[PDB]
Design a protein around this ligand. Structure first.
Ligand SMILES: [Mg+2]
Ligand SMILES: [Mg+2]
Ligand SMILES: [Mg+2]
Ligand SMILES: [Mg+2]
Ligand SMILES: [Mg+2]
Ligand SMILES: [Mg+2]
Ligand SMILES: [Mg+2]
Ligand SMILES: [Mg+2]
Ligand SMILES: [Mg+2]
Ligand SMILES: [Mg+2]
Ligand SMILES: [Mg+2]
Ligand SMILES: [Mg+2]
Ligand SMILES: [Mg+2]
Ligand SMILES: [Mg+2]
Ligand SMILES: [Zn+2]
Lengths: 148, 69, 217, 174, 111, 115, 37
RNA sequence: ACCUCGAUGUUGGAUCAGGACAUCCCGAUGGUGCAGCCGCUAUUAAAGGUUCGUUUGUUCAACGAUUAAAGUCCUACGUGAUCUGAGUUCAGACCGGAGUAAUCCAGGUCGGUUUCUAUCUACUUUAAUUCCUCCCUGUACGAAAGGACAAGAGAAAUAAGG
RNA sequence: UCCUUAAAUAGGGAUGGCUCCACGAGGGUUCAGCUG
């Protein structure tokens, strides 16, 4: 009938900033792996679902793992799906941000923050030893109201 | 064009006769199916397809390959 | 006197009593189901009850392309093509659910195994499903069909041209070059026909089996 | 071969008494123990079904060899590690094999499935110990079958109910 | 007993929108009776299929093994295979696009 | 035994099966715990650059006695729900499909010939 | 039960009992209050 | 910067895996914003299991298809006198850049010898699990849509032993 | 961004500089076949 839901998209992992060193190559270069993206929160329409009792009032999109050493990347946050009845108006502040009437329809409520880059990403001929590691972008956190 | 002009009509008559004693199936649906089969197709075939059509109709009439009960 | 192959046992250390018991069971089943004489290459129609269906009988007609196994478990695999789809079925002779075996066309082929019919043309495996059975004279040696089949392109299920197969029913001249034949001859193994210790003499075994069959009668 | 059977005092039998295949009956479940086929010293791949190593792509003299036998820390090999050695020729038991038929004339038991050991090998046969077959001995000859008793001369062949006896009309699944 | 008479009676009682029956010859190794029925919607199809399955389960034939219900996930075509008969529930569009009638009356004389 | 990457013959009336394409259909996945497909087992199939479910209805690998061994690995296209994509099957279909676990009534109904 | 190092009664009906070696806060009206040391 | 620079390159992969539980699945329970199904959360449980492919040395990651699950780790970032050398490491040569040049490079690329016959220790034959289908039963629960346990039966798959 | 695969960190295409005809145990990609 009507449910106030707090969807919080995942947070991208912060890239690492390390450097390689191996027996016969001491200055082996950057190993900062990039962080995984945050898992988006997507309201997928469900025909079986007929009321908004199922949907919770607090959804936290999974956050991506931080980048590791050895150029290891971070597992991106998995997509969180909110099954909703067919014909569900989604409104932020009386905005009707979505209608979600058709079967198979889906609206991305809170996009998971993108993952942060590692130093090896900035590695280049000009930059032979980057120290930068962009922090993982924060995930969206908004309050969406669902009306049948 | 067909095997004979009266062969098709006699076959339709025999099919309707066999549908007269129809017991389990929907008689109206059976008649509608026969009408569809003999109207949607039997207007403008080539002289060759008539033989195959009447042969298959005759086999259906015979029913040794499955009959409608 | 045609002794069915399954009766003659493959040599081994297994006790003769096991063969005696198996032959007793096989003969006692034959007393119910008449297993006619037939050879690899002869066309057979087998009627068997379907267990998947409600006992509805099923008939399969095809050329027997191999006779394998011994004892109660003996099988014969026969082949055909239905709507252009090659199908082979391995029928167990003594399965209690084969209602009947009919030798539609009794004949012998140049080879004791026609597995190469898989690679031969489909015509040599096609056989009319409703073909009527032919009649052979009561006192007459089984006809030997000297047909030599034509083979499709060289990629085959097996290297039929190799000597070890000892195929005689294939027109190798048509599909294989003389160079290919000479290369295949590299596996000749001429001594294999002259090593006398490799030969399995079954005269006494056949005589004993015939005595057992006559006693059963 | 002489084998020992654990019995209750109820089933004691005077030494010297013969035993016959009819001591069992069709439909019973039995256990058969015997020395498996001896395969001699066998490599790890055949003995324990190890994957081995690839045939090509550089593998030098390692196609059927064991990999790392243990970790480096322990500085030893754990007891019971799977290593190449003699396979088979040991006593193994198959449990819960159904008795499909008994030929009394030749004293033959038809036991479902495979049994350990080669042909003409001596097998020790006893009533199944599985819990499902705990108390199925009500109808079996308790001490043993005594032909000398001659209560009813058994037929030549005793068949289980579902067995397609030879000589019966070809089965139709009607 | 549970036979094609029971089939037709139950189906008519639940008011199948259209019914048809084929006497499959014994030489065809499938079954004896091929029933094809059309229904209003997937809900009606499922309802009538469950009803007939319940009647089969409740009536008789304890020794007869239980019976599947195929096509539950699909909405336009269900089918129940009994020991001697097979029923195919569907919608008008599925029936007219699959033409099981011609297939099972004219075995090798159709497209 | 239809594994991954096997080239399979689409024995069906479906447009996907009967349409020419530079790449023959290949098994993409065998819906079985062990990736070995026998008669009645479902598989994924790459037809015309598309993923489609299909059903095994015969294979070259020998099976148990009394069952037919076909010359080519035949397969029938089935939608995700289970409805066969095609409306007719020409080559013989083994009768053993009836008693196997799983839904096969639709396929048997579509089939013309049994073996 | 929620594992707590310090056990606190939340409502009036919560009661402390030392069972099987450790303290528990049991509650009938609000079984949500179940706590284990 | 404490042992090893008086022949151990290193990362991945193959093989075999031993171990911890801070449990991914399967088992038993408490709570729930637990009607049921899905779930979330916490206690207990390490017997068993924990997939295959495309790109790329790549571990990781992305993507495709699955699974009951595709767990986090330690084991000389386990294991190279069991294997591989794909990146990386010497001699050769290019692109970009620095340098007057010789040359150089945490950059990109093409190529590039992986020995050992085992003396000692150790070791070398020690009651299964899960998925699916049916029944219960489209029953409990629910207004409906949906949809259960437990128990039973059938099918398989893997693992062990033949 | 498009093609190639189901999936594509691979491959292909949107005075000097262009221009691959031929050739290459050069380095990548690939159809089909082939095969332990
Ligand atoms: Mg082959
Ligand atoms: Mg190998
Ligand atoms: Mg080698
Ligand atoms: Mg494509
Ligand atoms: Mg100091
Ligand atoms: Mg724990
Ligand atoms: Mg460490
Ligand atoms: Mg290298
Ligand atoms: Mg470099
Ligand atoms: Mg290189
Ligand atoms: Mg080179
Ligand atoms: Mg070495
Ligand atoms: Mg050595
Ligand atoms: Mg490649
Ligand atoms: Zn309280």
């Amino acid at each position: 009938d009507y449910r106030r839901v707090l969807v919080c998209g995942g947070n991208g992992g912060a890239g690492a900033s390390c450097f390689h060193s191996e027996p016969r190559k001491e200055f082996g270069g950057p190993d900062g792996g990039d962080g995984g993206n945050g898992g988006h929160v997507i309201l997928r329409v469900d025909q079986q679902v007929k009321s908004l009792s199922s949907v919770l009032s607090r959804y936290q999109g999974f956050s991506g793992e931080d980048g590791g050493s050895k150029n290891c990347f971070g597992r991106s946050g998995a997509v969180l799906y909110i099954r909703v009845p067919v014909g569900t108006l989604v409104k932020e502040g009386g905005r009707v941000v979505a209608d979600l009437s058709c079967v198979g329809d889906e609206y991305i409520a809170a996009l998971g923050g993108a993952g942060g880059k590692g130093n090896r990403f900035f590695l280049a001929n000009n930059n032979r030893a980057p120290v930068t590691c962009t922090p993982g972008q924060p995930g969206q956190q908004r309050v969406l109201h669902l009306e049948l | 064009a067909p095997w004979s002009r009266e062969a098709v009509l006699s076959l339709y008559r025999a099919l309707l006769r066999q549908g007269r004693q129809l017991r389990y199936t929907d008689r109206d649906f059976y008649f509608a199916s026969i009408r569809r089969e003999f109207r949607k197709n039997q207007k403008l075939e080539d002289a060759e397809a008539r033989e195959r059509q009447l042969e298959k109709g005759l086999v259906f009439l015979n029913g040794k390959l499955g009959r409608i009960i | 006197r045609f002794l069915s192959p399954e009766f003659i046992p493959r040599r081994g250390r297994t006790d003769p009593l096991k063969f005696q018991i198996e032959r007793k069971d096989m003969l006692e089943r034959r007393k119910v189901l008449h297993i006619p004489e037939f050879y690899v290459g002869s066309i057979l129609r087998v009627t068997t009850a379907d267990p998947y269906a409600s006992g509805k009988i099923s008939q399969f007609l095809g050329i027997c392309i191999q006779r394998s196994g011994r004892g109660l478990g003996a099988t014969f695999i026969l082949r055909n093509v239905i709507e252009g789809q090659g199908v082979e079925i391995c029928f167990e002779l003594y399965n209690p659910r084969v209602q009947e075996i009919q030798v539609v066309k009794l004949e012998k082929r140049l080879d004791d195994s026609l597995l190469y019919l898989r690679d031969a043309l489909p015509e040599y495996s096609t056989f009319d499903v409703n073909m009527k059975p032919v009649v052979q004279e009561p006192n007459q040696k089984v006809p030997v069909n000297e047909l030599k089949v034509k083979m499709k392109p060289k990629p085959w299920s097996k290297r039929w041209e190799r000597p070890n197969f000892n195929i005689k029913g294939i027109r190798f001249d048509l599909c294989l070059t003389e160079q290919q034949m000479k290369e295949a001859q590299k596996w000749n193994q001429p001594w294999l026909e002259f090593d006398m210790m490799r030969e399995y003499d079954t005269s006494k075994i056949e005589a004993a089996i015939w005595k057992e069959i006559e006693a059963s009668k | 071969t002489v084998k020992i059977f654990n019995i209750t005092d109820n089933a004691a039998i005077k030494p010297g008494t013969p035993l016959y295949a009819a001591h069992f009956r069709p439909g019973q479940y039995v256990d058969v123990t015997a020395k498996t086929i001896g395969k001699g010293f066998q490599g790890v791949m055949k003995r324990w079904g190890f994957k081995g190593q690839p045939a090509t792509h550089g593998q030098t003299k390692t196609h059927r060899r064991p990999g790392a036998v243990a970790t480096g820390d322990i500085g030893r090999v754990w007891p019971g590690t799977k290593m190449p050695g003699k396979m088979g020729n040991i006593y193994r038991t198959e449990y819960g094999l159904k008795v499909w038929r008994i030929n009394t004339k030749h004293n033959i038991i038809y036991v479902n499935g495979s049994v350990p050991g080669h042909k003409n090998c001596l097998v020790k046969v006893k009533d199944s110990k599985l819990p499902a077959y705990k108390d199925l001995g009500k109808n079996l000859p308790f001490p043993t079958y005594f032909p000398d008793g001659d209560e009813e001369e058994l037929p030549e062949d005793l068949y289980d109910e579902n067995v397609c006896q030879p000589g019966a009309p070809s089965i139709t699944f009607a | 007993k549970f036979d094609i008479d029971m089939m037709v009676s139950l189906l008519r009682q639940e008011n199948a929108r259209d019914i048809c029956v084929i006497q499959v010859p014994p030489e065809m190794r499938y079954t004896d009776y091929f029933v094809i029925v059309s229904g209003t919607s997937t809900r009606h199809l499922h309802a009538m299929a469950f009803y007939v399955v319940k009647m089969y389960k409740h009536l008789k034939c304890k020794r007869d093994p239980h019976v599947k219900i195929e096509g539950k996930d699909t909405d336009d075509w269900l089918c129940v295979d009994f020991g001697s008969m097979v029923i195919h529930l569907m919608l008008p569009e599925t029936r007219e696009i699959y033409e099981l009638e011609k297939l099972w009356t004219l075995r090798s004389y159709d497209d | 035994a239809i594994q991954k990457m096997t080239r399979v013959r689409v024995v069906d009336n479906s447009a996907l099966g009967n349409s020419p394409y530079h790449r023959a259909p290949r098994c993409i996945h065998v819906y079985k715990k062990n990736g070995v497909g026998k008669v009645g087992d479902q598989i994924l199939l790459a037809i015309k650059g598309q993923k489609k479910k299909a059903l095994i209805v015969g294979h070259c690998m020998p099976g148990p006695r009394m069952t037919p061994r076909f010359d080519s690995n035949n397969v029938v296209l089935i939608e995700d729900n289970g409805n066969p994509v095609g409306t007719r099957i020409k080559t013989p279909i083994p009768t053993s499909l009836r008693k196997r676990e799983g839904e096969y009534s639709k396929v048997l109904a579509i089939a013309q010939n049994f073996v | 039960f929620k594992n707590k190092t310090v056990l606190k009664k939340r409502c009036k009906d919560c009661y402390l009992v030392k069972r099987r070696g450790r303290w528990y806060v049991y509650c009938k009206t609000h079984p949500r209050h179940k706590q284990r040391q």
